[PDB]
Amino acid sequence: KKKVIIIGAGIAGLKAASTLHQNGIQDCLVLEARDRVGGRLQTVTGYQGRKYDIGASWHHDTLTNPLFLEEAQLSLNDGRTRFVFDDDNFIYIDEERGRVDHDKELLLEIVDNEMSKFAELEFHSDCSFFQLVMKYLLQRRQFLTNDQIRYLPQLCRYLELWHGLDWKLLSAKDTYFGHQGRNAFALNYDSVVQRIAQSFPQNWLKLSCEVKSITREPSKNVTVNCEDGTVYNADYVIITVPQSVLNLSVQPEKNLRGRIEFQPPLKPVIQDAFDKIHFGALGKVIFEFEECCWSNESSKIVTLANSTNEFVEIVRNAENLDELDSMLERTSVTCWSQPLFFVNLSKSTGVASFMMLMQAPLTNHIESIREDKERLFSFFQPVLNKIMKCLDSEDVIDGMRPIENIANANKPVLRNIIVSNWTRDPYSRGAYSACFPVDMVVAMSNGQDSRIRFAGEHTIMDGAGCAYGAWESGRREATRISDLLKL
Amino acid sequence: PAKKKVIIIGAGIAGLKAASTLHQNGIQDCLVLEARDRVGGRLQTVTGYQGRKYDIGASWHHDTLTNPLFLEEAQLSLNDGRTRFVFDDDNFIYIDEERGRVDHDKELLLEIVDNEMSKFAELEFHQHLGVSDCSFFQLVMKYLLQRRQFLTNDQIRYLPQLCRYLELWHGLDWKLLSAKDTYFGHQGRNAFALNYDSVVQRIAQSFPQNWLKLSCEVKSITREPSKNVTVNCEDGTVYNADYVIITVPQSVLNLSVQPEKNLRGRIEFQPPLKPVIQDAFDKIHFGALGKVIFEFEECCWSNESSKIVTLANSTNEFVEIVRNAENLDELDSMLERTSVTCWSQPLFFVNLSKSTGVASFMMLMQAPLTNHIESIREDKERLFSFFQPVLNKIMKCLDSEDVIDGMRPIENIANANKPVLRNIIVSNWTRDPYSRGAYSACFPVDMVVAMSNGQDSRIRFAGEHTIMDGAGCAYGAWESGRREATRISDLLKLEHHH
Numbered sequence: 001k002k003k004v005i006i007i008g009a010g011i012a013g014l015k016a017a018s019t020l021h022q023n024g025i026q027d028c029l030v031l032e033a034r035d036r037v038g039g040r041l042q043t044v045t046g047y048q049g050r051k052y053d054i055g056a057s058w059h060h061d062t063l064t065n066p067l068f069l070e071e072a073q074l075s076l077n078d079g080r081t082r083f084v085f086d087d088d089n090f091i092y093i094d095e096e097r098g099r100v101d102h103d104k105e106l107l108l109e110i111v112d113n114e115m116s117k118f119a120e121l122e123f124h125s126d127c128s129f130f131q132l133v134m135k136y137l138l139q140r141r142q143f144l145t146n147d148q149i150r151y152l153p154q155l156c157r158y159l160e161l162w163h164g165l166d167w168k169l170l171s172a173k174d175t176y177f178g179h180q181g182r183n184a185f186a187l188n189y190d191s192v193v194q195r196i197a198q199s200f201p202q203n204w205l206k207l208s209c210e211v212k213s214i215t216r217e218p219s220k221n222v223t224v225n226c227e228d229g230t231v232y233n234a235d236y237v238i239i240t241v242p243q244s245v246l247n248l249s250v251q252p253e254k255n256l257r258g259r260i261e262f263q264p265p266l267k268p269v270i271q272d273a274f275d276k277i278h279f280g281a282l283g284k285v286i287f288e289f290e291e292c293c294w295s296n297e298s299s300k301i302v303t304l305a306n307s308t309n310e311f312v313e314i315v316r317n318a319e320n321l322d323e324l325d326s327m328l329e330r331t332s333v334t335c336w337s338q339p340l341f342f343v344n345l346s347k348s349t350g351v352a353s354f355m356m357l358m359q360a361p362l363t364n365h366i367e368s369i370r371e372d373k374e375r376l377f378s379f380f381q382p383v384l385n386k387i388m389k390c391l392d393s394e395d396v397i398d399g400m401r402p403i404e405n406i407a408n409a410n411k412p413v414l415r416n417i418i419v420s421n422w423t424r425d426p427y428s429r430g431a432y433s434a435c436f437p438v439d440m441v442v443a444m445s446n447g448q449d450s451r452i453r454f455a456g457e458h459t460i461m462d463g464a465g466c467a468y469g470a471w472e473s474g475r476r477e478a479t480r481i482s483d484l485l486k487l
Numbered sequence: 488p489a490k491k492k493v494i495i496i497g498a499g500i501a502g503l504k505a506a507s508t509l510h511q512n513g514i515q516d517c518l519v520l521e522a523r524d525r526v527g528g529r530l531q532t533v534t535g536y537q538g539r540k541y542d543i544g545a546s547w548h549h550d551t552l553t554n555p556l557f558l559e560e561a562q563l564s565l566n567d568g569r570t571r572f573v574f575d576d577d578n579f580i581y582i583d584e585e586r587g588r589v590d591h592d593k594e595l596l597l598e599i600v601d602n603e604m605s606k607f608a609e610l611e612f613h614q615h616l617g618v619s620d621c622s623f624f625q626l627v628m629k630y631l632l633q634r635r636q637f638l639t640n641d642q643i644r645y646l647p648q649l650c651r652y653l654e655l656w657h658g659l660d661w662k663l664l665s666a667k668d669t670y671f672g673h674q675g676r677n678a679f680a681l682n683y684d685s686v687v688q689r690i691a692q693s694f695p696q697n698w699l700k701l702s703c704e705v706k707s708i709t710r711e712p713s714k715n716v717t718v719n720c721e722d723g724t725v726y727n728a729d730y731v732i733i734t735v736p737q738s739v740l741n742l743s744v745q746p747e748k749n750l751r752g753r754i755e756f757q758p759p760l761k762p763v764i765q766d767a768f769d770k771i772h773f774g775a776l777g778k779v780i781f782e783f784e785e786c787c788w789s790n791e792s793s794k795i796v797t798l799a800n801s802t803n804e805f806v807e808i809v810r811n812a813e814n815l816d817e818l819d820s821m822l823e824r825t826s827v828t829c830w831s832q833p834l835f836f837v838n839l840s841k842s843t844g845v846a847s848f849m850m851l852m853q854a855p856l857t858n859h860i861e862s863i864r865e866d867k868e869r870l871f872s873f874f875q876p877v878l879n880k881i882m883k884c885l886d887s888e889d890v891i892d893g894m895r896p897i898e899n900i901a902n903a904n905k906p907v908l909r910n911i912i913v914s915n916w917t918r919d920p921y922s923r924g925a926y927s928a929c930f931p932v933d934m935v936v937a938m939s940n941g942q943d944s945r946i947r948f949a950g951e952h953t954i955m956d957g958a959g960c961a962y963g964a965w966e967s968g969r970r971e972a973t974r975i976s977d978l979l980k981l982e983h984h985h
């Protein structure tokens with residue numbers, strides 16, 4: 001029947017569909033399991049109609065990001081605001097100390113820089129980012145004060161919100177990575193998705209179509225089966241489901257929502273690749289306040305996990321990486337058990353809200369209780385008040401239920417909380433490609449064969465794990481299949 | 488005709504480390520011929536108001552994560568608890584004449600666009616096709632052009648001036664500086680040496696005293712076909728050696744390729760320096776980093792930071808030209824439009840009060856300013872008058888009052904919150920015939936190769952301009968000394984049984 005069948009309507013699949021059409025191609029399809037397009041790009045709506053990207057929210061590498069450049073030109077042509085450069089000077093908050101950023105005596109950003117060059121030098125075996133930070137501290141303690149030894153490691157973990165992985169689950173070798181310039185906050189990624197999706201025959205889109213299996217016949221024809229019985233046959237097939245999903249293609253049984261049974265099975269180089277690449281769990285929590293009543297100094301605030309001086313003496317005393325490694329091994333998870341990244345939306349978008357980013361293992365636990373508004377307010381209440389105090393304000397009032405308080409005005413009134421759910425959603429099963437302490441790109445880039453091709457943020461190297469990477473990978477596979485068929 | 492194993496010309500850190508290595512390797516009958524009445528060369532520690540000491544030459548140990556000289560000094564300190572240095576990096580304070588402090592600003596966010604700029608440059612040359620180099624200025628104008636849609640007006644105005652602190656890394660005005668060589672990734676924090684002289688003396692002291700010959704200016708070096716090298720000091724003496732390690736500055740060694748033998752510092756080579764060496768001089772130059780010390784009575788200002796950069800003047804008109812230019816071509820035409828002031832270029836001040844407790848400012852300057860300011864380094868009244876505006880402005884931003892000129896003490900006991908300037912020291916590297924500049928710099932490898940491969944097996948070269956790792960730095964100079972001394976040590980070892 002069809003020329004090419006695109007599986008998944010994330011930005012990868014959408015771009016691909018866009019290309020094909022743009023290449024005059026016809027008779028294609030976009031099969032999406034969810035009842036909406038966008039995949040890991042979703043803009044939700046909350047209090048008083050405020051909108052928030054619960055999925056991707058920034059255009060990274062604006063100096064070379066091609067998706068971003070395209071958006072910029074559109075904006076040069078029509079003056080519509082599509083984004084805002086929200087990079088800012090980070091505010092770091094510790095529970096006891098308070099602010100420790102731009103400190104006259106702590107000079108933490110400066111040692112962090114050094115720490116980073118140290119990381120580049122170490123490589124230029126591989127351990128965990130946590131293990132790398134310990135070596136650094138050990139090897140440079142002679143030139144680090146006691147307060148730097150205490151806090152630096154906590155501040156430097158802000159990188160956890162970059163991969164969505166705690167410093168002990170994260171590969172040190174992939175941790176530090178330069179960026180091609182500032183970041184631009186998308187003021188409607190849904191506008192990016194919408195545009196691409198409305199640039200090809202709207203009749204190609206088939207929502208709520210979970211694909212159960214993909215089969216390779218002899219007669220250069222591929223057969224796709226959505227689990228509702230309906231079956232399709234096409235020339236080429238572009239698979240864009242998340243790596244975490246695709247990975248299911250090689251496990252016991254075949255049920256598990258999302259899993260696609262391949263026929264024949266996926267080659268060994270492919271299945272091998274899943275052994276050398278994991279997936280992160282970046283999550284988000286939106287805190288909607290009645291109105292801003294705090295200082296809008298910065299739009300970037302990070303709260304540090306708690307630290308101790310007992311940790312220092314062990315740095316001072318340890319003789320080597322083993323004495324320290326063994327001395328360190330010497331519960332209760334709260335809002336102060338890990339670093340939390342808060343985007344203060346008031347300064348950058350004028351919205352009285354906080355977009356907080358979180359990592360594994362915390363993400364999954366918070367998303368598990370996403371419907372428990374009071375439990376959620378109780379869990380983050382401490383860091384929220386600590387933030388408000390540092391930003392010259394008061395403790396948060398809970399106004400999530402009818403009948404505010406009448407005596408607010410000077411106190412931040414929380415009106416709502418929104419939480420992501422990517423780790424519990426079967427069609428995402430996590431946030432995006434991440435490294436545990438490479439080859440998948442090549443595996444995907446080639447394909448299962450000349451007609452069973454792939455695409456997605458995990459099928460490319462430039463822009464890996466990013467929206468534009470997935471966007472481009474969608475064009476790659478697209479352009480190709482196009483050149484041929486066209487004939 | 489005094490016979491000697493090795494003759495090292497110059498007693499800077501390169502020659503001193505060379506001789507040191509030699510001694511440490513059991514080599515005797517060596518000489519260190521130095522023209523000045525001191526050792527140290529570009530490492531010199533002067534004395535000023537009330538016995539305060541300052542390094543008018545090198546001040547920092549750079550790339551501490553890898554710098555072998557530094558690591559060697561830190562080891563010592565770990566053994567005796569003696570403080571030999573101090574990590575003085577800090578959050579930079581940027582002062583505009585108009586806008587006052589513009590650092591860490593919630594709206595300007597200068598350091599942030601500066602970072603993106605560094606990245607733009609990296610992305611501009613890392614992908615090395617037939618690149619085509621240009622001045623650093625040209626590089627910045629290109630950045631502003633390509634990214635104007637993502638920069639506010641004030642960023643376009645103040646970024647190009649704030650990014651010029653780099654002029655103080657090379658000692659060159661951004662119009663004279665190679666863009667391709669502008670950005671350098673430092674291997675970690677810097678360590679402010681608390682007297683570099685201590686490093687100089689410790690090394691000097693590590694080999695025979697009588698090995699040293701000060702105030703002897705070498706004027707010629709001849710290679711006898713009889714497998715020996717002849718060296719002549721100006722004070723008539725003549726020496727004969729198996730090997731020679733020339734460490735004169737690249738600027739002085741350059742004089743060798745020109746006709747005119749009576750130039751202070753110049754060495755007449757026979758045979759003349761090979762063509763590969765001569766021609767290498769067309770491919771690298773010398774910068775003019777200079778210093779000025781503003782000594783104060785006592786500290787009556789904020790010690791938030793020890794790093795203060797004063798930006799040069801900018802104009803909203805510049806913003807308009809960038810906003811209206813169609814390409815680099817037109818931007819230059821448009822940019823094409825008096826006299827030099829303390830605001831005509833960025834200046835870098837090290838507020839020592841915080842970092843060392845000494846109520847003084849160590850200010851760095853670049854070419855061409857350095858030349859002009861060193862040319863009048865005696866007219867103190869003119870110096871003060873020249874640096875009064877920025878000096879006052881700094882003090883204002885640091886919660887203090889204008890400067891009072893007390894360089895000629897006339898009793899002042901009623902100005903506790905008023906800063907009193909008592910002295911002004913100025914470097915003199917451009918006019919000193921044995922330095923003729925600050926160190927090697929690029930105008931928009933040939934040299935490092937020609938030098939490292941020597942004039943011939945017997946005539947060798949060392950110094951900050953003869954090596955890649957640490958080029959232009961004290962530790963690179965130091966390393967090159969170890970390099971040359973080792974090669975010879977080995978050859979003299981295989982010396983037909985001794």
Ligand SMILES: Cc1cc2nc3c(=O)[nH]c(=O)nc-3n(C[C@H](O)[C@H](O)[C@H](O)COP(=O)(O)OP(=O)(O)OC[C@H]3O[C@@H](n4cnc5c(N)ncnc54)[C@H](O)[C@@H]3O)c2cc1C
Nearest residue numbers: 008010011012033039040056057058211431456457466467
């Ligand atoms: C919390 C969070 C924050 C992020 N922030 C940023 C950011 O700031 N900047 C940035 O660049 N990136 C960010 N990302 C990453 C970005 O979202 C992804 O790179 C990009 O959206 C991945 O696109 P994709 O098209 O490959 O897949 P989309 O998920 O990403 O998924 C492919 C599609 O496959 C469908 N599918 C799966 N299984 C089946 C099946 N069996 N049958 C049919 N359809 C199926 C899915 O429903 C989905 O629509 C973030 C991600 C998360 C989770």
Ligand SMILES: Cc1cc2nc3c(=O)[nH]c(=O)nc-3n(C[C@H](O)[C@H](O)[C@H](O)COP(=O)(O)OP(=O)(O)OC[C@H]3O[C@@H](n4cnc5c(N)ncnc54)[C@H](O)[C@@H]3O)c2cc1C
Nearest residue numbers: 497499500501522528529545546547705950951960961964
């Ligand atoms: C103002 C200034 C600031 C600096 N700051 C730093 C810094 O912070 N950190 C850093 O790492 N580097 C810094 N440097 C660079 C550093 O000082 C040099 O890299 C290093 O000192 C060069 O050492 P050298 O041994 O090769 O030569 P030294 O000058 O550098 O010179 C070799 C010796 O040869 C002698 N000589 C010359 N001609 C003759 C002759 N004809 N006969 C006999 N002897 C002769 C000279 O007098 C001299 O002593 C700075 C330089 C300047 C000028």
